[PDB]
């Protein structure tokens, strides 16, 4: 139930292919709006555990998150 995930990830693009690492997405989320800590970085690691390699493959692992 989502669309334009390509542009959504390219907005906060760090590696050029939307595969921003866990720390990349962490500082993207913390800098804009709310900020958090070790709990947030553990939560981000859990979220990126679907890929299991750091390079968040959004185009594949967005469907489960948006389902």
Of 32 and 52, nearer to other proteins (C-beta) is 32
For 49, the 3-state DSSP assignment is: coil
- Regarding 65 and contact with other proteins (CB under 8 A), the answer is yes
Residue pair 18/6 in contact (Cβ under 8 Å)? The answer is yes
- Binding to other proteins in span 17-56, by CB under 8 A: 25, 28-29, 31-34, 43-44, 47
Query: Can you tell me the distance from the alpha carbon of 25 to that of 21, in angstroms, rounded to the nearest whole number?
Result: 6
Which residues bind to other proteins, rule: CB under 8 A? 1-2, 4, 7-8, 11-12, 25, 28-29, 31-34, 43-44, 47, 65-66
């Amino acid at each position: 139930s989502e669309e334009e995930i390509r542009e959504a990830f390219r907005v906060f693009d760090k590696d050029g292919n939307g595969y921003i690492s866990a720390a990349e997405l962490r500082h993207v989320m913390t800098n804009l709006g709310e900020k958090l800590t070790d709990e947030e970085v553990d939560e981000m690691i859990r979220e990126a555990d679907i890929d299991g390699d750091g390079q968040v493959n959004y185009e594949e692992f967005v469907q489960m998150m948006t389902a």
